[PDB]
Structure 1
Amino acid sequence: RRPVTVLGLGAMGRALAGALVAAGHPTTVWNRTPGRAAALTAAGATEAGTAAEAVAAGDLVVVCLLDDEVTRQVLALVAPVLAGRTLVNLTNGTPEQARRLAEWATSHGADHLDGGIMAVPAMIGQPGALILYSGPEDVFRAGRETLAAFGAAHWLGADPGAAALHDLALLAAMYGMFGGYLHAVAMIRAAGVPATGFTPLATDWLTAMLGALPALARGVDSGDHAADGSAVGMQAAAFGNLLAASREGGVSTSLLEPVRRLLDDAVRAGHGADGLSALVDLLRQS
């Protein structure tokens, strides 16, 4: 029943607004370009003419704009009417951007919640769509039933930057997996072997390697970088054949070279007998 507002009508903002109206929430939408709210209006949404009007029509203000600069601009305009409202920043950004926006919102009499959307716009509203949230737990509690219209809502903690932090961290892990899988498929493809038949072996192997993550995490947190199984120095010695075989098949090594360098660095640093947990500190530029 809680009136909701969506600022930003891209693919994601439209998906968010559509899930809101389909869950029965009275939804008022706005965008810096007209005509984007046509199917929304038909389903029962109200299109406001100004962002300020949209904000004044919502107790929960969902923001899903292009980036934090756009967000900082549109919001500075609606700053006098934020008092008493809850700002839900779903705009992709950085943890520091989130924390600064949280301070600005509090200075203007508004509650603040940040969200990292882990689902594609087409999956918004379905079971399985995941959005991570961070901010004051009671702000999350009062908005949870409304956020559930988008899908799963996982609160991570009070830090306003925690949602974006875990979002982007998970993205890094995903890009690493996919990059390594894509390289493997290119190697397989170069030999004339179908990727379809290779995928089961890859999933079994990668699932097995997921079992090594708890041991890696313990070594990182404790500082004891004990080689669980393969030490970095052995893994560095075996990387050369991977690069050579990639060259044989005419496959670029660009995705793997930075991992090769990181392993060689740990060996040069005297960590050849340690496990992969010793590579985390090597990524520090401080």
Structure 2
Amino acid sequence: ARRPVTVLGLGAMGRALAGALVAAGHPTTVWNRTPGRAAALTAAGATEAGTAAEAVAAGDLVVVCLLDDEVTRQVLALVAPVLAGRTLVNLTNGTPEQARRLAEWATSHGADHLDGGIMAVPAMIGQPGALILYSGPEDVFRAGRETLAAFGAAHWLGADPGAAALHDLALLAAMYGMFGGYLHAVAMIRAAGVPATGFTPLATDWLTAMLGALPALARGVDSGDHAADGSAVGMQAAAFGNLLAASREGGVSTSLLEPVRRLLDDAVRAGHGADGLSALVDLLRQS
């Protein structure tokens, strides 16, 4: 039932993942490059190993949560002789192409492969609300899905090994988008002596409602029909000029706004002024 797992990487997230597996009843074998990181985990039942090969030999599922991909692929080489017959689960973050290169390496050593992107902070691992995106052979995922649940939620995005990274990084770009907009709003609000707490209620409500617009932008993106609904790219543009002028007269930098300006203006010059926001997506694809 609770299958034996290996955790390679005893950093902040490594120790939260390993703890989560012990707290779930999985016999957890850990390993770190530097010693001294497993005292509370070993006192919970975890076994610390001295060799990375030793560790990986003690699990049918090898969770890897190292620093970058550079570290990861080095370490996994040292274990390459014993890797065959286990599933790799790289919860280390990276690019989608890196995930796709490691999938080849793994499959050339007779190891299955799953990539993951943790949408959670170490402090939430094991507890509700944690999300870890996963990508890889659907086969491999179904088998590990329950093991992986010890971390939180397991959401599979497809057999593209880079699918976890891609949704991880895209969800970051969205997050940074909203926050970027919000901090500029706050900067404008603060420039005029207006307290920030107090505006955020109104912001959340506004943004919550705006989120209901996305299913229609989704449609037009996938459809091709970039038809408007009451505010076409050309109108939205004129509105952005006031936003740039309000920021320039209150003493706030337009730096976060200037890309959005150019993408709107470029859709006007492209022929989408009477179209909807969905037509701005392939405008970001220079390929």
TM-score, normalised by the number of residues in structure 1: 0.97
Distance 1:14 1:250 in 2: 45
Give the CA deviation at 1:162: 1.0
Give the CA deviation at 1:63: 0.4
| RMSD, aligned α-carbons | 1.1
Once the two structures are superposed, residues 59-91 of structure 1 have per-residue CA deviations (whole angstroms, 9 ceiling, x without a partner) of 110001111111111111110100111111111
Once the two structures are superposed, residues 237-280 of structure 1 have per-residue CA deviations (whole angstroms, 9 ceiling, x without a partner) of 11111111112222111111100011111112222111111111
Distance 2:169 2:191 in 1: 32
Once the two structures are superposed, residues 186-245 of structure 1 have per-residue CA deviations (whole angstroms, 9 ceiling, x without a partner) of 111222222221112111111111111111111111111111221111111111111111
Number of corresponding residues: 286
Kindly report structure 1 stretches of 4+ aligned residues shifted beyond 2 Å: none
Partner of 1:112: 113
Give the CA deviation at 1:19: 0.8
Distance 1:156 1:180 in 2: 28
Once the two structures are superposed, residues 16-42 of structure 1 have per-residue CA deviations (whole angstroms, 9 ceiling, x without a partner) of 111111112111111122211121111
Distance 1:141 1:236 in 2: 47
Distance 1:224 1:148 in 2: 40
Give the CA deviation at 1:180: 0.5
Distance 1:126 1:134 in 2: 22
Per mean C-alpha deviation after superposition, the further-off stretch among 172-181 and 30-39 is 30-39
TM-score, normalised by the number of residues in structure 2: 0.97
- SS of the residue 2:21 aligns to: helix
Partner of 1:9: 10
Equivalence map 1:118-129=2 (5 Å): 118-129=119-130
Distance 1:72 1:28 in 2: 20
Partner of 1:211: 212
Are 1:215 and 1:228, in contact at CA under 8 Å, matched by a contact in 2?
no
Per mean C-alpha deviation after superposition, the further-off stretch among 117-126 and 190-199 is 190-199
Distance 1:211 1:229 in 2: 15
Give the CA deviation at 1:160: 1.3
Once the two structures are superposed, residues 109-138 of structure 1 have per-residue CA deviations (whole angstroms, 9 ceiling, x without a partner) of 111111111001111110110111111222
Give the CA deviation at 1:142: 1.2
Distance 1:73 1:49 in 2: 17
Distance 2:271 2:130 in 1: 44
Are 1:63 and 1:71, in contact at CA under 8 Å, matched by a contact in 2?
yes
Are 1:5 and 1:57, in contact at CA under 8 Å, matched by a contact in 2?
yes
Give the CA deviation at 1:5: 0.6
- SS of the residue 1:113 aligns to: strand
Are 1:130 and 1:152, in contact at CA under 8 Å, matched by a contact in 2?
yes
Give the CA deviation at 1:285: 2.2
